Amino acid sequence: RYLVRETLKSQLAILFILLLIFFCQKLVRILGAAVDGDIPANLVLSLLGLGVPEMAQLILPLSLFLGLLMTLGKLYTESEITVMHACGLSKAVLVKAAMILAVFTAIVAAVNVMWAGPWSSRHQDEVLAEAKANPGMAALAQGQFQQATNGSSVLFIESVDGSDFKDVFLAQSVVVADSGHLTQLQVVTLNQGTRFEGTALLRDFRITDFQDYQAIIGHQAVALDAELNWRITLVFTVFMMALMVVPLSVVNPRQGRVLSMLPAMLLYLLFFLIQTSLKSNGGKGKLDPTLWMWTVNLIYLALAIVLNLWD
Amino acid sequence: VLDRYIGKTIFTTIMMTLFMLVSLSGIIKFVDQLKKAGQGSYDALGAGMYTLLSVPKDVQIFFPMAALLGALLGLGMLAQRSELVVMQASGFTRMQVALSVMKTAIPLVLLTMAIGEWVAPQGEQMARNYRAQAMYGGSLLSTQQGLWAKDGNNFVYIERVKGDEELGGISIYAFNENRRLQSVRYAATAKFDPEHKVWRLSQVDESDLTNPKQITGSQTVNLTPDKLGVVALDPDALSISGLHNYVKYAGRYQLNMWSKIFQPLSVAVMMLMALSFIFGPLRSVPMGVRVVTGISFGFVFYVLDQIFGPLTLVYGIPPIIGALLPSASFFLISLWLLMRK
Amino acid sequence: ATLTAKNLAKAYKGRRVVEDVSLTVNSGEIVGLLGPNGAGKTTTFYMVVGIVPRDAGNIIIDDDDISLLPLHARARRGIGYLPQEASIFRRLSVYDNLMAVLQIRDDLSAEQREDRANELMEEFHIEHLRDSMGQSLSGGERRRVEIARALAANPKFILLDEPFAGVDPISVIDIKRIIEHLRDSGLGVLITDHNVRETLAVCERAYIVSQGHLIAHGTPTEILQDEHVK
Amino acid sequence: ATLTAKNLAKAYKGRRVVEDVSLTVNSGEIVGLLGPNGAGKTTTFYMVVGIVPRDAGNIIIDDDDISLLPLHARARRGIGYLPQEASIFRRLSVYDNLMAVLQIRDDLSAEQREDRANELMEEFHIEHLRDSMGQSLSGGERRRVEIARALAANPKFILLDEPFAGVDPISVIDIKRIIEHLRDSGLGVLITDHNVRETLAVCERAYIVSQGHLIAHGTPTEILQDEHVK
Numbered sequence A: 001r002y003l004v005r006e007t008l009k010s011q012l013a014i015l016f017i018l019l020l021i022f023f024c025q026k027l028v029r030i031l032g033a034a035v036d037g038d039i040p041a042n043l044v045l046s047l048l049g050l051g052v053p054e055m056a057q058l059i060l061p062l063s064l065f066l067g068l069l070m071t072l073g074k075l076y077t078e079s080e081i082t083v084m085h086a087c088g089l090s091k092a093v094l095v096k097a098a099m100i101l102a103v104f105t106a107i108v109a110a111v112n113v114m115w116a117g118p119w120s121s122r123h124q125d126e127v128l129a130e131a132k133a134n135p136g137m138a139a140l141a142q143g144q145f146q147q148a149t150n151g152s153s154v155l156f157i158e159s160v161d162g163s164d165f166k167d168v169f170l171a172q173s174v175v176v177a178d179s180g181h182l183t184q185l186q187v188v189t190l191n192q193g194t195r196f197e198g199t200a201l202l203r204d205f206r207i208t209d210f211q212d213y214q215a216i217i218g219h220q221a222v223a224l225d226a227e228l229n230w231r232i233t234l235v236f237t238v239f240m241m242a243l244m245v246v247p248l249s250v251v252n253p254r255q256g257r258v259l260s261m262l263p264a265m266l267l268y269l270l271f272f273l274i275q276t277s278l279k280s281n282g283g284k285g286k287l288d289p290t291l292w293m294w295t296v297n298l299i300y301l302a303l304a305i306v307l308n309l310w311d
Numbered sequence B: 001v002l003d004r005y006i007g008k009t010i011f012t013t014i015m016m017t018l019f020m021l022v023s024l025s026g027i028i029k030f031v032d033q034l035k036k037a038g039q040g041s042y043d044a045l046g047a048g049m050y051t052l053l054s055v056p057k058d059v060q061i062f063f064p065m066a067a068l069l070g071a072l073l074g075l076g077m078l079a080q081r082s083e084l085v086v087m088q089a090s091g092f093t094r095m096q097v098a099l100s101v102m103k104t105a106i107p108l109v110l111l112t113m114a115i116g117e118w119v120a121p122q123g124e125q126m127a128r129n130y131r132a133q134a135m136y137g138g139s140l141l142s143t144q145q146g147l148w149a150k151d152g153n154n155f156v157y158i159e160r161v162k163g164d165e166e167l168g169g170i171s172i173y174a175f176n177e178n179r180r181l182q183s184v185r186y187a188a189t190a191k192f193d194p195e196h197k198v199w200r201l202s203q204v205d206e207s208d209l210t211n212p213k214q215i216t217g218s219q220t221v222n223l224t225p226d227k228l229g230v231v232a233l234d235p236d237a238l239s240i241s242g243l244h245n246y247v248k249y250a251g252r253y254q255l256n257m258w259s260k261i262f263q264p265l266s267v268a269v270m271m272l273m274a275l276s277f278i279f280g281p282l283r284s285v286p287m288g289v290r291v292v293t294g295i296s297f298g299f300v301f302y303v304l305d306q307i308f309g310p311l312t313l314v315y316g317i318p319p320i321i322g323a324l325l326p327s328a329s330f331f332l333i334s335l336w337l338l339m340r341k
Numbered sequence C, D: 001a002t003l004t005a006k007n008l009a010k011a012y013k014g015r016r017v018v019e020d021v022s023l024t025v026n027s028g029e030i031v032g033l034l035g036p037n038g039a040g041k042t043t044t045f046y047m048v049v050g051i052v053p054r055d056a057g058n059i060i061i062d063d064d065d066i067s068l069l070p071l072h073a074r075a076r077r078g079i080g081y082l083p084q085e086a087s088i089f090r091r092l093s094v095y096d097n098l099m100a101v102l103q104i105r106d107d108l109s110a111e112q113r114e115d116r117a118n119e120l121m122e123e124f125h126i127e128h129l130r131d132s133m134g135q136s137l138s139g140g141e142r143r144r145v146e147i148a149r150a151l152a153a154n155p156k157f158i159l160l161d162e163p164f165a166g167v168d169p170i171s172v173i174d175i176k177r178i179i180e181h182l183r184d185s186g187l188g189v190l191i192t193d194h195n196v197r198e199t200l201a202v203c204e205r206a207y208i209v210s211q212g213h214l215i216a217h218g219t220p221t222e223i224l225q226d227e228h229v230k
């Protein structure tokens, strides 16, 4: 006999409408790499689903936080938590229910990093990198700087759509092209070219004429040319915020219903704010030089307990 | 008059929610750059930077979303307290109410149009300029990077960039329409000088190609100045005349040119959308649903803005279309909720 | 002056909630509109007000069908309205509230608005609270300001919504005296309460909607004869 | 079998609302608690309920200072309470609501819970609404369900907050019949309301607060004949 199936419905709803908010955040972020960061967008829809678990790290505790808070708001403004209090039920019965929710969502956040967190992390470690190497229909004219592992080879074309080229410019010094065309599989079918490499006057002054050269400079340049904290602290968020939000879902008559959510949200995001700030020095696992984080973890567990209890 | 009442009410709700959405994003970006201030100071990548950096948020980042939430809560007060229907049952028309809100919308368009070209561009300039302690930051101070210039037929590779506006520098690829090289220079002493010296003739190390054999070379001792040589600031940099730069030759720079000058339309259409709400599916559902619908359509505006701006890739749709698409097609949903019943 | 409704209709997903109400109100009389809770009073009164639109029927002021005309149009033609809950402007003064409703009167001047305001304030006993804030007033003083604000528009049929709710019998008899003062003024009053034996004693005739039907219509004693509700 | 409030007191940041008020409620009688609008009908009742915290006061059931308890500990030790508005678990069935109250009946068996549930459903006539969805009940059905939940926790002194506010005078008489059946089941019932002419006609004795002070009490005849009522 519990209200757990009533709050589980809003749990599922807030889950389903937070995944799209964070999709629409990470998608707006990776459009920055599709436009400015110069990464081809043949991998947007794939990169979303391959990286949804690092997104759902932070969905599920806030999902249970909202799915408890918005539910017990209705349960209190129908004057119904205060009729469970008018019967012999206590605050402890909805505490039992909320901690059952905490068990369920903590199982979710655990099996995240058990079977899909690092799995998606080491399949997102490749960006489908073997097709980042293997070319397709990606040129992206007026760009392609890529200083790393290419020298400084920039090759832009002052054209319109790809039929009449001006200053293909083919840097490495630079070889200069007049005409050009396009084929795929690194073999570009350009007509003319003029190599030049003279840096100083005392050096060589090397020219080549217009020749039947194919200009292979597109080479597959690879880069070879704590979880100990989060695995416990996110499960502690899921285990703690359920016990923390029930003394804050108390909706008062005068201040209204949504202003009865400001202190819970102002403490929840202050929590995640201080946790992310104290993720400053992390060392990636085996180098952990600070543990001020369990200070705020223990003091918010104390804040939850102190809040709840009122003797 | 109660023209004063509705106007000052909407204005103070705008200012209150605007100060709220300034303070929230200010402390969040404060503790965000607190994750890299190991070379700055306690406040250098902090409070001394954000006391300037609050106003470019205030121009365009939150000011449409805060515009809807302010002109929604401040006019939902008048329906919560059963107070808009008082004047609407005294005979004060809904077009009287729309004119009463937009009679004081004019300081909001005036305000953001002033700040977004007087205080906010120089604000984020000085913000990135003050982050020169912790390195790697691209600003008016650039770093040791080869900025591949493109001056029409002319092209210049850069070797080294300093902070005193000097360059062991300019390597002119003097290329005509015959692609005949005239200079192979290395401008080792490119010191900043006034407007007579937008390119200063430094350190002649050239060779002309008047003949394949005879070369008139000289070892003795383009139209992109330093206020146009700072190009890494891809968000809102400066005014329309300087943004009219890549012109005798780039789609996103005129896209941002339109996005600079459509934010007043964004605020005005935003208040019109708030009034179509308060005369639409609202007026019966309570303040929780008011503020949920508020942040929902504000985030819808944010995602349509920050996608359909950068979405201009497939057809390469015109930037007037790409910038008005989160404004005119939000005016449209407002207009439909007006004339729906 | 005569306001008349004919064959009022409202439904929801085809389920009829209002079935053929035809109420009348003349100037001078105090028409009551009672019934059960949520079976005619709210919807019928709010259609006659103009908060909600009609589906079939006529609303007529003096041989002029205003059924297409919305609430602000009915106010510009002569119907006033007072809401249930507290409906004062919580930031102006009482003085500025009365002038703020006198602004939209396109038939006045600078001295005439001050004169009409001083008339209404000296008549409704708020002229000593002239410089007060309506947010920081009491219930009876606030009802004085709301009735004075309704009279600032110079109406011809004021349609009160719950004046006899939530107050002690002393304030009941004070609001009784202000409705007696309005029937001295020659203004028609239409009223809906759930205080039957505290509202039906002032009405010169009252209409009793009952699940759509006006099964009782006429004087309060004739209403108390039939018990087709009870 | 006797409840007594001794010397209640409450303020709101230097705004006093109750000033040394003591009320006595014996078993088996409809005790009223009336007054002026918001000067102690709400506050004194909510202290005897226990929603608001007092400062000084003594609540006694058989020499038990239950004044320091939370709300449900008073409900644990024989006090009932019914709220003002729709306190129905709208997404439960009615038998689930009654058993949901009956889960904390440690002094009963694992089958006497269902036996008492059958008794209450035979008494309050919800035998066809036993498995209806708790949203889909009407007014009197909803009142009977909430009173059945109250009695399923088996109280001695039940405390109702406006059981008449928002019902037509048919359901008023039916609720009076229900409250007389409650006191004929032997409960000392306390009622506050804005309806003195509806409350005083069913109460056997009533208490009249005024500005943090009981100024009259006892029989409704003396409450009619005391200091100002008309």
Ligand SMILES: CCCCCCCCCCCCCC(=O)O[C@H](CCCCCCCCCCC)CC(=O)O[C@@H]1[C@@H](NC(=O)C[C@@H](CCCCCCCCCCC)OC(=O)CCCCCCCCCCC)[C@H](OC[C@H]2O[C@H](OP(=O)(O)O)[C@H](NC(=O)C[C@H](O)CCCCCCCCCCC)[C@@H](OC(=O)C[C@H](O)CCCCCCCCCCC)[C@@H]2O)O[C@H](CO[C@]2(C(=O)O)C[C@@H](O[C@]3(C(=O)O)C[C@@H](O)[C@@H](O)[C@@H]([C@H](O)CO)O3)[C@@H](O[C@H]3O[C@H]([C@@H](O)CO)[C@@H](OP(=O)(O)O)[C@H](O[C@H]4O[C@H]([C@@H](O)CO[C@H]5O[C@H]([C@@H](O)CO)[C@@H](O)[C@H](O)[C@@H]5O)[C@@H](OP(=O)(O)O)[C@H](O)[C@@H]4O)[C@@H]3O)[C@@H]([C@H](O)CO)O2)[C@H]1OP(=O)(O)O
Pocket: A021, A022, A025, A026, A058, A062, A265, A266, A268, A269, A272, A276, A284, B021, B024, B025, B026, B028, B029, B032, B035, B036, B061, B062, B065, B066, B069, B136, B294, B295, B296, B298, B299, B302
């Ligand atoms: C009511 C119900 C509630 C609703 C739900 C709530 C909604 C919440 C939404 C949140 C969703 C997203 C979650 C999230 O966001 O999640 C996290 C957030 C947690 C909290 C969220 C949830 C909240 C709690 C729950 C809710 C509770 C209520 C953050 C994150 O994620 O953390 C970090 C993130 N912070 C945020 O995002 C803030 C968050 C904040 C969230 C706010 C939430 C607010 C909710 C409000 C609630 C209200 C009630 C209270 O979100 C944002 O704001 C986004 C906007 C969100 C708004 C959404 C709408 C809200 C609407 C609400 C109503 C509906 C931050 O950057 C984001 C900023 O971007 C824009 O600014 P800019 O434009 O950029 O300025 C935004 N501007 C904007 O948006 C625009 C506007 O402003 C805002 C508009 C918003 C909408 C406005 C309207 C809203 C509607 C209003 C309606 C009313 C800013 O906005 C800001 O400022 C903040 C802003 O004001 C505030 C936001 C405003 C919100 C207001 C809301 C109001 C609502 C009111 C009503 C409700 C924003 O902050 O940094 C990282 C990402 O950058 C990365 C990447 O990974 O992508 C990593 C980079 O490295 C960086 C770094 O940036 O960190 C930079 C480097 O230069 C360097 O500095 C480095 C170190 O510092 C060095 O020392 O660090 C780099 O990587 C790689 O780059 C290169 C690579 O390519 C190789 O070449 C390499 O070289 P290099 O080239 O050199 O770089 C790099 O190697 C470096 O390092 C090496 C070593 O270190 C080795 O270490 C290795 O390992 C390490 C790992 O182990 C680490 O894990 C890593 O270091 C690396 O892997 C590394 O390899 C060196 O090696 P060595 O040599 O030493 O050996 C090496 O040499 C070199 O140095 C590296 O490898 C690169 C990329 O990878 C390239 O490939 O980019 C993130 O880390 P990550 O993502 O985790 O990784």
